Structure formats: structure tokens, C-alpha cells
Design a protein around this ligand. Structure first.
Ligand SMILES: [K+]
Ligand SMILES: [K+]
Ligand SMILES: [K+]
Ligand SMILES: [Mg+2]
Ligand SMILES: [Mg+2]
Ligand SMILES: [Mg+2]
Ligand SMILES: [Mg+2]
Ligand SMILES: [Mg+2]
Ligand SMILES: [Mg+2]
Ligand SMILES: [Mg+2]
Ligand SMILES: [Mg+2]
Ligand SMILES: [Mg+2]
Ligand SMILES: [Mg+2]
Ligand SMILES: [Mg+2]
Ligand SMILES: [Mg+2]
Ligand SMILES: [Mg+2]
Ligand SMILES: [Mg+2]
Ligand SMILES: [Mg+2]
Ligand SMILES: [Mg+2]
Ligand SMILES: [Mg+2]
Ligand SMILES: [Mg+2]
Ligand SMILES: [Mg+2]
Ligand SMILES: [Mg+2]
Ligand SMILES: [Mg+2]
Ligand SMILES: [Mg+2]
Ligand SMILES: [Mg+2]
Ligand SMILES: [Mg+2]
Ligand SMILES: [Mg+2]
Ligand SMILES: [Mg+2]
Ligand SMILES: [Mg+2]
Ligand SMILES: [Mg+2]
Ligand SMILES: [Mg+2]
Ligand SMILES: [Mg+2]
Ligand SMILES: [Mg+2]
Ligand SMILES: [Mg+2]
Ligand SMILES: [Mg+2]
Ligand SMILES: [Mg+2]
Ligand SMILES: [Mg+2]
Ligand SMILES: [Mg+2]
Ligand SMILES: [Mg+2]
Ligand SMILES: [Mg+2]
Ligand SMILES: [Mg+2]
Ligand SMILES: [Mg+2]
Ligand SMILES: [Mg+2]
Ligand SMILES: [Mg+2]
Ligand SMILES: [Mg+2]
Ligand code: NA
Ligand code: NA
Lengths: 197, 49, 68, 144, 145, 96, 128, 229
RNA sequence: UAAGCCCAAUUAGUGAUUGCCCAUUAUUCCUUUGGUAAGGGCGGAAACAAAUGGAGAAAGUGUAGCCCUUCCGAUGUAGAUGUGGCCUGGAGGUUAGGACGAAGCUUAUGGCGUGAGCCUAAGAUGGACCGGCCUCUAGUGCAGAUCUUGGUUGGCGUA
RNA sequence: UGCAAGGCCGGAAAGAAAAGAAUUAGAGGCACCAAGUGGGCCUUCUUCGGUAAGCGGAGCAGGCGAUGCGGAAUGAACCGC
RNA sequence: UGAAAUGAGCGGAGUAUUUGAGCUGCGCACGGCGCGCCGCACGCACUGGUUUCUUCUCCGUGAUGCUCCAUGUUGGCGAUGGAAAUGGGGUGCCCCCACCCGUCUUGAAACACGGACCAAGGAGUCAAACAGACGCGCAAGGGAGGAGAUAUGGUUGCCAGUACUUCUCUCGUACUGAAAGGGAGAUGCAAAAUGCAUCUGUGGUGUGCACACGUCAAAUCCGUUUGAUUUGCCCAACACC
């Protein structure tokens, strides 16, 4: 025998196939699996990994977020160079809080109907991942983007709300209930809002 | 032990075994034993005197 | 019927299976809450000015890049 | 479907994942929320703080309809303006009129920057919302 | 509009032509040169295909789908009959004109068709000799019209 | 026990050096069955037909220091009914 | 038709894995069942007990599923099924389903002889 | 006749074949020259020490030999009933299995490590023949995480990517003389997996000086390992 | 004149440093299986009828695994999870079989699978229905619960 | 212009020499959802009560429980593995 | 059994090249005596010389094979038979192994409990509330439900299905306070107890995919790839504000 204590703890949960039943997702995975192994680009490898990911791990992105980070890169970019193609492995959703956006080329798995209308009306173009593979096979001049997930309600519930320093929402259908003892100093004690780590 | 593998890893091994054959030659071994003892003994006497 | 009262047997083995994790580095979670207030208040004034300096400095860099 | 449950995988396992020692008995903790302060206190205290006790004034015969007051921010106002009117709207000219109470809103709150100037008819308005919409070329008209 | 790649994904696990009998996946596809259930050999699925088929006598027929009338099923497949004695490489060249990736299997199938026709005549001749020495109580004769 | 290898003691072979001389020799165990079955040269030499049967093996290595020998039989293992019975140790394949 | 030649079949184990103590009870079938008893000598791997099946007994993948004749068994039910095996007739042999009747078997046997398609359970008199 | 993409491949492959043969001849010449240089270094070093010993003896003096810099350690106990301190040291020594063997520097930090796990390992000071036999017969490299037997000198050159380690004799020289690349060479090798000693041991539970096996045997470890390699 | 105790050896003051026997250990070879697996090939190279070199080559988690090369691990109660993993009654599809004999039943009927099981053969059995595959569904798998019901049974030609 | 703090701009960096002067089958951090378990027992050293116990109670660490295999004739825990 | 034999081994050449061992030069190391004298076992450098004996050394075949299978010799048996083989199955025998299952238990082969046989039956189910993982649709909006309308005012039945609709309802886009009640953008200018201006914009800082500029290292079939690093922007996140 060989002493291999805790060797199984070194292994990691790595998925190679997708759980998706979408045939067009499988076509994209087939296309970008080929590109991630026959090209040297790091963009194709990252895109291929994100196509295998679950829906929860492909958070959607707002149109205002794309335009903001595009402007942060538009400055400090030479006028000779064209703007990169924004690529997100996920959904692009419209944002009613920002009406005036520049013309951008956006590639995404799915566009909401309003988001596609807003991109086109600004002079931009909504791209498709098989179109991207033909104009940027190695991902040259692209802006890979991810949607936000820290604001999800599931994340806001994670952890115990009764321990000091915690601010997670409890699981409760009634908002008025679960507010008296343990939440106010007058009723026995209050859960401490801050704790040094 | 393999001839191919030893030569492949060590291209110089042919010269090493040729030297080994010489030291095991009876005439070479006996002549060297006589010469080595005589020259070491002469050096020992000269150093002590 | 009496049973065992207490033992620490196997506890060190249990604590080392997923190992004893090291402490968080000093540069993380270095909150100043609860520290000496007079120094805390003065540090906030400097940090507020530093943010204003950072905002202005990016404005100069953007104009300088567009200058060429 | 029954063919996907853990019961089918446990056919021949005897104990069905409940153990030989502890077994699967009827009610080993009590029924429902029993013992919230005795022998289930830690679970209640760390996961549901505030559960026990009283707080606040009573309101007999609450009617939610008199308390109806949905709010909309200034930066969400384009949700209620048609697309063709929003493009034509600009400060100093003719602006669209937004009837909040007919769209299901009672108060204009005023978070963020307004995207299209307009005339908003509202039952309530926050002091910041009224100031911001006037500086941007719009106005607030009170309705009931 | 709907490419072969998309169609193959849809029908790979469940199709009329797929036979999973005893753990073996075969195909009844009339335009399959092999009987293997693969995307390359799915003649009914590919935009262009060619299958080597037997003909009357020792002739070898090559059925070709050139991808021009795929929306008209009665015109999708065109037949060209090669005279008996055709070289197997000539049949394989005809298939390679449409599907260069089927040149090797088409050559082997062209050879097998010629072998079968020769064996069929040899087996049928031996059967006729055996029947000539047997008295049969019944003999059905299909009526002519 | 492991029946894939058998132990054979040969008369006048009482040393490990003695047993090394027999490494590789063909070993035969001779018995008889109840009926006459097929044999080598069944049709060539009809006089060979008999109930006599033979199982053939070879000496693989010596065993111990007392001339004991290890024998492996062809394919199958020697029957346990052969324990205490005569084993023939031939002089071929010859190395002399 | 002769089958394609392969390496020699090993068959790591010939004996079946039979249920513990099924010989002592007419009720129990010999079909394998994993012994889950806490004091079971079979589950505990005692020296003189029956073996339990595991992944190590798996047969060589090169010679797996190959029948002693050298072919692989493909079930067939009618004459049209024989044409799936025309090209790979040195790899597969047709097995006529048990329920197929004698009338239909005559046509299947007749056709398979002309195509040189081996039938595992076909006519014994034919093919000699 | 032939497709264009299949034609460009032929010329590229032909040039690859020519360059591969040239590299094989270049490495063979380089390994030959280095092996001759090491061979004379070893012979001269022992001849120098023989004279030094003779000179001291003739005038009633003594010669103090250099303290050995390299130790060869083999695990002689199974994996059962090991205390956590001894368990971790054997893990850091890569001695996770019985009769596993490694080369270590015989410095103070390593010596105190070896003293703590003395009942589990027999060790000593390797000879040049012992180092060569382990590298040539039992030498494996960690290539892409795989345990690959050393079958030619190109693997050694490609694995180490170092000017000073391109052949087997470079690998032996680094281990034997405790060179500046001793860690790089020894770390790049898989831990040696040796056979049990033919002829048996004496007593694995006692120290060597007690008539057992688990101590430091000094140069007697070479006789022990000669029956194992 | 130990086959006892203490000590010490390995064919013995000869000429140098492995007496011998037993493992689910070690080394090594073959096969399986699974990886935090590591790599290659996959644009059919060209040519080739039968009577008289062959076959395959799927861009792929998982199958009879797309094929080939390479390395490492493999026991396990309670327990978790996975399986183009097995089996049963029904449903939507698809494709078949049956009076030249369906279901059921019988077996020193063999073959296949590590297995759950699948399939063939025979009936000197039966007499009318039923198989495969994809999906859907559930009163879906028995050796024991002083388990339920029916039948049988040694005790016993005994008390 | 000194101390304290937060930054900015530069310089230098055997990336840690030499003196025995580390080693690693050395991918670190972060989560989520849950099961069984919550009667233990035996040994090495330490050790408390007891005359003592195959007695009761602890510390460190191995082990049995959950595990066979090769040995001590026989033995859950000893030896080897 | 040569279906790519990579060979010090096969094939071509050549009659030599260079490994040691002896003997040796100069200088330096080393040893001994105390400035340079002696010694030097023959270490380093000149890859020193010498050739006395001791060795063989020099070239050579890519896959235009993606994969699997397929090619000796000599006898015995087998010339179509109630047969010769190999495999499987059955029964006995020999030598070795080998405590009775299920269960509770620290501990079961137990003088611990349930266990005569067979057949058929026999135990994690349905509903509701919530949560997490995964699949799917839409997305700052999502979706009903009840009901109605008509294909259907039709048809034994298929059709209790399918197709269509909703100024509503509900969950969210806003949260806080016991309540009365209030209610969240950035930058700039400035310090008004509701301050002004502008609206293409991550509030700031540190760490941070890809991408873009370079810059080194290694390997290249010289087309590149594969690692590291500088700078810019930093997405998702994390930590301080
Ligand atoms: K209750
Ligand atoms: K499997
Ligand atoms: K009964
Ligand atoms: Mg939020
Ligand atoms: Mg007690
Ligand atoms: Mg307790
Ligand atoms: Mg059971
Ligand atoms: Mg279990
Ligand atoms: Mg459970
Ligand atoms: Mg419980
Ligand atoms: Mg109480
Ligand atoms: Mg009160
Ligand atoms: Mg079997
Ligand atoms: Mg137990
Ligand atoms: Mg039947
Ligand atoms: Mg011993
Ligand atoms: Mg011990
Ligand atoms: Mg393996
Ligand atoms: Mg061709
Ligand atoms: Mg697959
Ligand atoms: Mg396991
Ligand atoms: Mg039912
Ligand atoms: Mg059907
Ligand atoms: Mg019978
Ligand atoms: Mg029977
Ligand atoms: Mg079935
Ligand atoms: Mg049931
Ligand atoms: Mg039953
Ligand atoms: Mg009972
Ligand atoms: Mg009776
Ligand atoms: Mg390391
Ligand atoms: Mg207890
Ligand atoms: Mg309990
Ligand atoms: Mg030669
Ligand atoms: Mg001097
Ligand atoms: Mg062969
Ligand atoms: Mg012959
Ligand atoms: Mg016995
Ligand atoms: Mg009990
Ligand atoms: Mg008890
Ligand atoms: Mg028991
Ligand atoms: Mg008892
Ligand atoms: Mg009881
Ligand atoms: Mg509805
Ligand atoms: Mg909210
Ligand atoms: Mg309120
Ligand atoms: Na594998
Ligand atoms: Na237990």
C-alpha cells in the first residue's frame, strides 16, 4: 500500500459536459470546444468553460453596465483602434435607467427584446456566438464580461442571521414576525451588527 | 543490463568497458601490481628520509 | 446506568482531516471600527481628501491621453 | 415521478438511509415547532432571531386599500412614457404627461437621474423628487 | 436554415432508422453504405449523400443526393446504373464526386455487391438442381393481367 | 496449498546443486483410467491404445537444500490422487 | 463466411456469482445479491467463502461480447433485417428471434445463404 | 494527385525529420563529452584522496574525510500505525510506500528530520555505482504529472530545460557530488520504487547496531541496496 | 551427541561479504475499472470489380465505450452520490412478430454480461396474443417483520 | 523641515549570498445544500480512586468498531501487512 | 516468425580511433623542515608526451500506416463419421481451504432474539408551505387564477383536450420607523437649516478573467506556442472606506 491520506480531498468538482437540454447550446459547445483546443487564444478557453456552466452561474448583464465599462475602456484607447466587441456568455437585459448609449457590438447567448431594440436604435449590432467565431476566431479585440450575482436574493439569505456580525435575511413569509427577541436590545438581547474577523 | 539502453543513455559506456577489460587483463594486472608497489614504497622511503 | 463523562479522543484527528486553516492575512479584514476615535476621525478627513485627489488625477490622465 | 425518488435506489438496502442505530422513529423531536425555547433553542436563536415576544402598537381592522401607496423613482419614469413621445421630449418644449394613479402609482420618489423630462401627475412627491424634476425641465402636478 | 449538425443532435438518440438491438446500434437507412449509426453515414440526414445499391443482373446502381432538391422528396435521389462489370474504383469515384469522405466505404460496398451477385447465381443454381429431383405436391403461379 | 506448482522428490537427488541439473527436464505422471480413450499415434500405432494415460510437466526450479524440485504441469494441475505416486523425470531436453 | 480473427478470449472467470446459501433454500434463486448482513462472512471476505463481483473481473474489451464462433450476436426478426449486416458480415451474425415462426424462418434462412450472412441459430444442415 | 494542404504538410514534416536527426546526433556528442569529463573527475578525485591519506600516514598524522553531503533513504516499514509527526516527515520525504527510496542532502535540517523517523527508514551514504544503478535501472521522471521511465537523453533535456542537465550522466553527477542543481534533479525524479532485498533482512524492528535494520548503516547501505535495485 | 537454554553463522582459518520456506506486502508483466486524468488522429493521401489483403475511422460526459498511446488510484459498516445501469404493470410514439403456434410454464439449452439480467435451443408443453427502441407514468423488484392467506411437511403408521 | 496617519512620485531589489543554511505524490482561497453519528471499546507511554479486578475515571497517540489477508496452535484489539 | 527488426545486437563500409594501464616534461597544488630547501605515492592545467599492452569505430532506412485484424518448422489427431478437437454443463472422488443466517451490540458461531417448506401478497406514499441545486421560458418585469368568448350553437366518442382574451389579482422593480410619517445618482462650483450648474456614466482605494501595447525565457517543423512579466482597462468577485 501507499500512504495517500486525504488524497480525495485534493480532487475538485470539474464538469466537462453541460446539463442543458438546448440543442443550440450543444452546437455552440461543439464549436468552441474545437476552438479551445486548436487555437492558442485564452479567450476561446474561457468562453468554452462558461458555456458548460449552469444557468445560475451565467448571471445576466444589464445594458447600462456594458456601456459604462465600455466608456471606461473607450478613454485611454487610441482613436485609430476600433471599440472591442462586448462578449458575455449569458443574457443581456435592457436598463430603463440609462436611455442614451453609444453604438456597440454585443455578442451574447440571448438578448431580451427591449435590449436588442436599444442596441440597434443606438447604431450598434447584436451579434451571435457563431458570428463571433467568424470575425474573431481567436477573440482578438474583445471585452469579455460577466453579469452580477452578489445582489441575488438567495445570496442575501445565505448564512445564519442570528450570529453577531451577520446581516442575512431570514427565511420568513411574514415580515412583521421574527422582530422582537434577539433583534432589539429591549427584548432580552440584540444580535450584534458588527464582529471583527 | 540492456545493451541498447545503456549505450543510448551513456554514449561513453563503450570506453568505460574497454578500460575495465584492460584492468582485468592478467598481464596488465600483474605488471601494474609490481609497478604500483615499487613506486609507492620508494615514495614512502623518500618522504620519511 | 452510567456512561462516559468526557474525552478528547479523536478530536485532534477530526480537526486535522480538513486541516487547521491558517489565519486571514493582515491586509484583509483590517477594519478600524472600535479603535481610538480621535485618530479614526482624523484619518477619515485625509481619506476624503485622497479620494478627491484620485478623482482629479484621473481627469488629468484622460485629458493627457486625448492630448496626443 | 416515482421512478426518480430515493426509494427506488434503496430497494435492498433495508434501512433506507436512516441507519441501524438511530433508526427512523415517529417523532423524535416533537411535533412541528415544539420546544422552541426548550431543546430547539439554538436553532431558533441563530436562524430566526426575533421570533418570540411582542412589539409595537396594535391596529384593529386593518384595511390595506386606504394604505395603498406604490412608488416610482425618477429614473424609472421612462417605463410609463411611450417611445415616440420620449424622443420628442426636451427641456423647454412640449413634454408628455404621466398620470401616475392611472398607471398604479401614488408617489414619485426621485432616486437617480431622470432620463426624459416630462410632466408627472402624482398624489405624493418626495422633496428631492420635486426639486430634481424641476431642474431638469419637467414639473409635478398634484392629483387625487 | 436547419443544418445537418442541428438535425443530428435531434435524432441521434431517437430515430426511426436507429436499431439498438442487444446493445448494438445499427441503421435501416436505405442511403447508409455501412449500417453504422453515425453522422457521416446518415444518408437520409446529410445535405449530400451517395449509396451503392444493387441492380438487376450484375449491375451496380449509385443513388446520389446532390443537395439541390432536398425540399422535393420525390426528386431528392437520382439513380445512375452502371453496366455489369464496372470497376469498384469507378463506382467509388462516382460517390467521391458528391462525398469524398465516403470513397473508401463505397469501394468496399461496390466490391461486396459484385460478390453477392456471383454468389446468388451459384446458390440459386445449386437450389435448382436439388429441386429438379423432388416431386412437389403444390406449385403456386401468380395470375397474369 | 497452491496447486499450480507441485513438489517432486527424486531418488539420489539430495542437494540443491543436484536439483539444479534437472531444471527444464520433462516430467511425466503415469496412471490409468477406466476406458480406452484417444492417445498419440492412435491410428499410426494401434498397439499403443490402452487405459494408460500420462500427464506431462517440466521442472521449474529447485526447492530447499535437499534436492526437492518444483514441477509445473502442462496447463492443468496434477491430480491430488498422484500424491505419493511415481513421477517420471526424463533426461531430455538434454544440455550435455 | 469466416469471422474476423481476434486475440484469444481469456474469460477471467467461468463460474457464476451465485447467491449466498441459495443451495440450502429452494426459495432462493442463484441470481446474485449483494450480502448486506453485518456479520456476513461473504461480505467480510473470509478466506473460504464465495467471491463477490467487482470491476476487476471485467473482460478484455478487444474480445468482449464475442461468441465462441468469433461473431457478435445481432438480433434479427425478418428478411429486411439481414441487409443491415451485409457489409459487416465478418463481424456480426444474425440471431433469429425465438417467436419468429417456421414459415418466416424459411425465407430468412434462404436469403442469408445468398448474402453470406452467418446465422447463429439458422439451419444447421446448411453451411455444413 | 495530392491536395495542397497535404503537400505543405510533407515539406514541413520532412524538415522536422531532418532537424530531429540533427538534434539526436548533437545530444549524443554532448552527452559523450560530459560523460568523459565526469569519468576523469571521479577517477582523479579518488586518486587525490589516496595520496592525501598516504602523506598523512607516513608522518604520523591523520586525514579527516569530508562529511558526506548526500544520503540515500529507503522506507522499510509499512503504512500501518504511524504517529502524525512521523507520518508527515515521511510524506515530505516522499516515502509513502515500503521500499520507496530518495536522495536527500545530509545537512542539519534534513538530519534532524531523519532522526525523528529512524525506525521507519534505513539510510546511508550512496556510492557512485549505487547512484548510477538507481538512475539507469529505476530512474523515472515526473513528466506532466506522469511517472515516465527514462529511456533516452532527450527526455532529460526537455524535462529540466537546463544547460547543466541534458543527459543521464549529468543527472548522476548532480546527485553524487551534491551539485547546485541537486534539488532540481531529485525533485524532477519520481521517488524510486525498489524491490525487497534478495536474501532477506535481519530484523526490521531493531537498529542496525543492535543487529537489526532501521539505522544509519554508513556505507553499508550500498550492499543493502544492491540486492534491491 | 536436543527437536531444551544463551550466543553466533550460512556450506566454513578456502581463498571475502544473498542457506532455505510461507502473504490479498514489494518489484515486474497481462487484463478491468475510475480519474482534478496527460497526449495524439478525425479536410477520408494516392491506387485497387466479381468468378478467386479485410474491415472500420462518430469533434465525442455517459453505450458494443470514435480510435490509439501514456500515467496514477482501486478494500470498507452507518451514510452520500452517479450509472445511453438491470427488471415489472400501464400511456404517447415508432418498428416488428404470431395457427408453419402468442403469453405462461419446464431445463446436466448453451451463449453473452463483473453483475442486476438478456438472448438462443428443446418441450415427446401450451393454445391467442405479443417483442425491441425513444419518451411518459406508477399500488414497480422480498428470505426472515412470534409478518398475512392458501397449500404442504418431518414428527408418524408414532402418542 | 520633528513624530502620527492616508496617499503620490521615484530608487533598489544575492526575489534572498556564504556559513551543514530545508523539504514537499507543495493548485491556495470562497461558498451552498444535506446524511449518518452524538451507548463506544482495546493497546503504548502518563495517570486518579480502589487490596485488587477481564473494575471505575482521565491526557497524548495509534487501533478495533468498519477489515479481511500472512503469523503468534486457538483469540475483534498482539506481530507483519 | 518480420505486416514499418533503429541494433555495440541488423546492414554497409574502415583497418583504424581513443579508453584505461605503465613510463614520463613544465608549472601549480599537496606533504616535511623553516626563507626557499627537500619530497611528491604520480591530484589540476597543457583535453601534455610516449604507443610498450588494452579496446573494434564510422555511417544508415518517417508514418504517402488514423485504427484493428491478417504471414513459420516438425510430427500426432482429424479424409464427413453414432467423429476428432476445444469450451460449457452434470455426478463422484482426491489434496487443500472453510463456524449459521438476519438483527441489537464495544463485542455473535454463541448457552443472546427471529428463523419446517413453497406459492401469492407485504412497507418513504399523495397533498400543501418554504428553501437550495439543476432544466426551461420571459425579464424590470414575470405569471396566473377564476371566468368568458368561439373553432365548438359542433361531434356516441376523439373534444374533461387544444387554440383565444383580461384597465384585474399576485410576486418583484425601495426601504425604513412602535407609529405619526419620511424615502436613496454622479461630477464640478461652492458651504445656501430643500445652494447652484452639467448629464456618454464604474463614488474611491487595494487585490483581481479576458483583451490591447510591449518585454524576457524555453522549445520550434521557423508558420509559431508556452510560460513569466510591464503598462492600460479592468468583467465577476473579495477587502477597506
Ligand atoms: K406541535
Ligand atoms: K459500464
Ligand atoms: K400458513
Ligand atoms: Mg440589488
Ligand atoms: Mg463501564
Ligand atoms: Mg455519551
Ligand atoms: Mg435482505
Ligand atoms: Mg450501505
Ligand atoms: Mg439519509
Ligand atoms: Mg435520530
Ligand atoms: Mg427547562
Ligand atoms: Mg407591551
Ligand atoms: Mg460468466
Ligand atoms: Mg461487526
Ligand atoms: Mg416458445
Ligand atoms: Mg525474519
Ligand atoms: Mg512495534
Ligand atoms: Mg489502471
Ligand atoms: Mg482515396
Ligand atoms: Mg457521447
Ligand atoms: Mg469501494
Ligand atoms: Mg398498477
Ligand atoms: Mg410496441
Ligand atoms: Mg431435462
Ligand atoms: Mg436440475
Ligand atoms: Mg425488456
Ligand atoms: Mg408495494
Ligand atoms: Mg415469495
Ligand atoms: Mg415466524
Ligand atoms: Mg406423513
Ligand atoms: Mg515539489
Ligand atoms: Mg456504554
Ligand atoms: Mg443511541
Ligand atoms: Mg556491426
Ligand atoms: Mg609547500
Ligand atoms: Mg498472426
Ligand atoms: Mg503439420
Ligand atoms: Mg479444517
Ligand atoms: Mg441485544
Ligand atoms: Mg451487552
Ligand atoms: Mg451474528
Ligand atoms: Mg456461551
Ligand atoms: Mg429483544
Ligand atoms: Mg389563464
Ligand atoms: Mg426588495
Ligand atoms: Mg409604511
Ligand atoms: Na481508461
Ligand atoms: Na456499531
Amino acid at each position: 500500500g501507499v500512504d495517500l491520506t486525504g488524497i480525495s480531498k485534493k480532487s475538485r468538482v470539474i464538469r466537462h459536459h453541460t446539463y442543458s437540454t438546448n440543442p443550440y447550446i450543444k452546437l455552440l459547445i461543439k464549436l468552441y470546444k474545437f476552438l479551445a483546443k486548436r487555437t492558442s487564444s485564452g479567450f476561446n478557453k474561457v468562453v468554452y468553460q462558461r458555456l458548460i456552466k449552469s444557468r445560475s452561474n451565467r448571471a445576466p448583464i444589464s445594458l447600462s453596465r456594458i456601456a459604462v465599462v465600455m466608456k471606461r475602456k473607450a478613454v485611454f484607447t487610441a482613436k485609430s483602434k476600433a471599440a472591442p466587441i462586448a462578449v458575455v456568455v449569458g443574457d443581456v437585459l435592457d436598463d430603463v435607467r440609462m436611455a442614451r448609449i453609444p453604438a456597440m457590438r454585443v455578442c451574447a447567448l440571448r438578448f431580451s427584446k427591449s435590449a436588442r431594440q436599444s442596441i440597434v436604435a443606438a447604431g450598434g449590432e447584436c451579434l451571435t456566438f457563431d458570428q463571433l467565431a467568424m470575425i474573431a476566431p481567436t477573440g482578438k479585440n474583445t471585452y469579455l464580461l460577466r453579469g452580477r450575482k452578489s445582489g441575488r436574493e438567495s445570496v442575501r439569505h445565505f448564512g445564519a442571521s442570528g450570529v453577531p456580525g451577520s446581516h442575512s435575511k431570514p427565511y420568513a413569509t411574514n415580515r412583521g414576525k421574527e422582530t422582537k427577541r434577539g433583534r432589539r436590545t429591549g427584548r432580552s438581547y440584540k444580535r450584534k451588527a458588527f464582529r471583527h474577523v | 543490463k540492456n545493451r541498447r539502453l545503456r549505450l543510448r543513455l551513456n554514449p561513453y559506456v563503450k570506453r568505460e568497458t574497454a578500460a575495465a577489460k584492460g584492468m582485468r587483463n592478467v598481464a596488465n594486472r600483474d605488471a601494474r601490481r609490481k609497478a604500483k608497489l615499487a613506486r609507492v614504497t620508494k615514495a614512502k622511503k623518500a618522504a620519511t628520509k | 446506568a452510567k456512561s462516559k463523562n468526557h474525552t478528547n479522543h479523536n478530536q485532534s484527528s477530526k480537526n486535522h482531516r480538513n486541516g487547521i486553516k491558517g489565519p486571514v492575512p493582515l491586509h484583509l479584514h483590517n477594519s478600524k471600527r472600535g479603535s481610538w476615535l480621535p485618530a479614526l476621525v482624523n484619518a477619515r478627513r485625509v481619506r476624503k481628501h485622497n479620494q478627491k485627489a484620485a478623482l482629479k488625477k484621473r481627469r488629468e490622465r484622460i485629458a493627457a491621453f486625448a492630448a496626443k | 415521478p416515482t421512478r426518480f425518488k430515493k426509494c427506488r435506489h434503496q430497494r435492498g438496502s433495508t434501512f433506507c438511509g436512516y441507519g441501524r442505530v438511530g433508526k427512523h422513529r415517529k417523532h423524535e423531536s416533537g411535533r412541528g415547532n415544539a420546544g422552541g425555547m426548550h431543546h430547539h433553542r439554538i436553532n431558533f436563536d441563530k436562524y430566526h432571531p426575533g421570533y418570540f415576544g411582542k412589539l409595537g402598537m396594535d391596529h384593529y381592522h386593518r384595511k390595506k386599500n386606504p394604505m395603498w401607496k406604490p412608488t416610482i423613482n425618477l429614473n424609472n419614469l421612462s417605463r410609463l412614457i411611450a417611445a415616440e413621445e420620449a424622443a420628442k421630449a426636451a427641456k423647454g418644449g412640449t413634454l408628455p404627461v404621466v398620470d401616475l394613479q392611472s398607471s398604479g402609482y401614488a408617489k414619485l420618489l426621485g432616486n437617480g437621474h431622470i432620463q426624459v423630462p416630462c410632466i408627472v401627475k402624482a398624489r405624493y412627491v418626495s422633496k428631492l423628487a420635486d426639486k430634481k424634476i424641476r431642474k431638469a425641465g419637467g414639473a409635478v402636478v398634484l392629483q387625487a | 436554415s436547419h443544418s445537418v449538425d442541428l438535425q443530428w443532435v435531434l435524432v441521434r438518440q431517437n430515430s426511426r432508422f436507429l436499431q439498438k438491438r442487444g446493445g448494438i446500434r445499427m441503421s435501416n437507412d436505405p442511403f447508409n453504405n455501412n449500417g453504422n449509426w453515425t453522422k457521416r453515414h446518415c444518408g437520409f440526414l446529410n445535405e449530400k449523400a451517395a449509396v451503392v445499391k444493387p441492380a438487376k443482373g450484375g449491375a451496380i446502381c449509385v443513388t446520389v443526393k446532390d443537395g439541390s432538391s432536398n425540399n422535393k422528396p420525390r426528386q431528392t435521389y437520382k439513380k445512375t446504373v452502371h453496366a455489369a462489370g464496372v470497376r469498384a474504383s469507378d463506382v467509388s469515384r462516382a460517390v467521391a464526386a458528391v462525398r469524398p469522405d465516403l470513397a473508401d466505404v463505397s469501394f468496399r460496398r461496390a466490391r461486396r455487391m459484385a460478390c453477392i451477385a456471383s454468389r446468388t447465381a451459384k446458390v440459386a443454381a445449386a437450389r435448382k438442381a436439388r429441386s429438379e429431383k423432388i416431386k412437389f405436391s403444390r406449385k403456386s403461379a401468380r395470375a397474369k393481367r | 496449498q497452491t496447486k499450480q506448482t507441485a513438489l517432486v522428490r527424486v531418488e539420489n537427488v539430495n542437494t540443491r546443486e543436484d536439483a539444479t541439473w534437472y531444471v527444464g527436464k520433462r516430467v511425466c505422471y503415469v496412471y490409468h483410467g477406466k476406458k480406452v480413450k484417444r492417445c498419440v499415434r492412435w491410428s499410426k500405432a494401434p498397439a499403443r491404445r490402452s487405459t494408460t494415460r500420462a500427464l506431462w510437466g517440466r521442472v521449474t526450479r529447485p526447492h530447499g537444500n535437499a534436492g526437492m524440485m518444483r514441477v509445473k504441469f502442462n496447463g492443468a494441475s496434477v491430480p491430488a490422487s498422484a500424491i505419493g505416486r511415481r513421477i517420471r523425470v526424463y533426461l531430455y531436453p538434454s544440455q550435455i | 463466411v469466416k469471422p474476423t480473427v481476434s486475440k484469444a478470449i481469456v474469460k477471467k472467470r467461468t463460474k457464476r456469482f451465485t447467491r449466498h446459501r441459495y443451495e440450502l433454500f429452494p426459495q432462493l434463486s442463484s441470481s446474485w445479491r449483494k450480502p448486506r448482513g453485518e456479520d456476513s462472512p461473504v461480505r467480510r471476505r473470509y478466506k473460504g467463502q464465495k467471491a463477490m463481483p467487482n470491476k476487476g473481473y471485467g473482460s478484455d474489451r478487444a474480445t468482449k461480447y464475442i461468441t465462441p464462433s468469433g461473431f457478435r450476436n445481432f438480433p434479427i426478426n425478418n428478411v429486411e433485417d439481414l441487409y443491415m449486416l451485409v457489409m459487416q458480415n465478418r463481424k456480426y451474425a444474425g440471431v433469429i428471434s425465438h417467436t419468429v415462426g417456421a414459415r418466416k424462418r424459411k425465407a430468412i434462412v434462404r436469403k442469408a445463404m445468398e448474402l453470406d450472412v452467418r446465422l447463429a441459430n439458422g439451419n444447421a444442415k446448411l453451411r455444413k | 494527385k495530392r491536395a495542397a494542404f497535404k503537400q505543405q504538410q510533407t515539406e514541413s514534416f520532412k524538415k522536422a525529420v531532418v532537424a530531429r536527426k540533427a538534434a539526436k546526433a548533437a545530444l549524443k556528442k554532448t552527452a559523450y563529452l560530459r560523460a568523459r569529463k565526469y569519468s576523469r573527475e571521479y577517477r582523479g578525485a579518488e586518486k587525490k584522496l589516496v595520496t592525501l591519506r598516504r602523506q598523512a600516514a607516513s608522518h604520523g598524522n591523520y586525514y579527516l574525510e569530508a562529511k558526506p553531503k548526500v544520503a540515500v533513504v529507503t522506507r522499510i516499514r509499512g503504512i500501518a500505525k504511524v504517529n502524525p509527526k512521523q507520518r508527515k516527515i515521511l510524506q515530505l520525504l516522499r516515502l509513502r510506500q515500503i521500499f520507496n527510496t530518495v536522495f536527500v542532502k545530509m545537512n542539519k535540517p534534513m538530519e534532524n528530520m531523519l532522526r525523528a523517523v529512524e525506525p521507519y527508514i534505513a539510510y546511508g551514504y550512496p556510492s557512485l555505482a549505487t547512484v548510477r544503478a538507481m538512475v539507469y535501472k529505476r530512474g523515472y521522471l515526473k513528466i506532466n504529472g506522469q511517472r515516465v521511465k527514462i529511456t533516452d537523453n532527450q527526455m532529460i533535456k526537455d524535462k529540466y530545460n537546463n544547460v547543466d542537465i541534458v543527459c543521464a550522466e549529468d543527472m548522476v553527477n548532480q546527485i553524487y557530488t551534491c551539485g547546485k542543481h541537486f534539488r532540481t534533479v531529485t525533485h524532477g525524479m519520481w521517488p524510486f520504487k525498489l524491490a525487497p532485498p534478495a536474501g532477506g533482512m535481519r530484523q526490521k524492528r531493531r537498529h542496525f547496531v543492535e543487529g537489526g535494520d532501521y539505522g544509519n548503516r554508513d556505507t553499508l547501505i550500498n550492499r543493502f541496496l544492491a540486492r534491491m535495485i
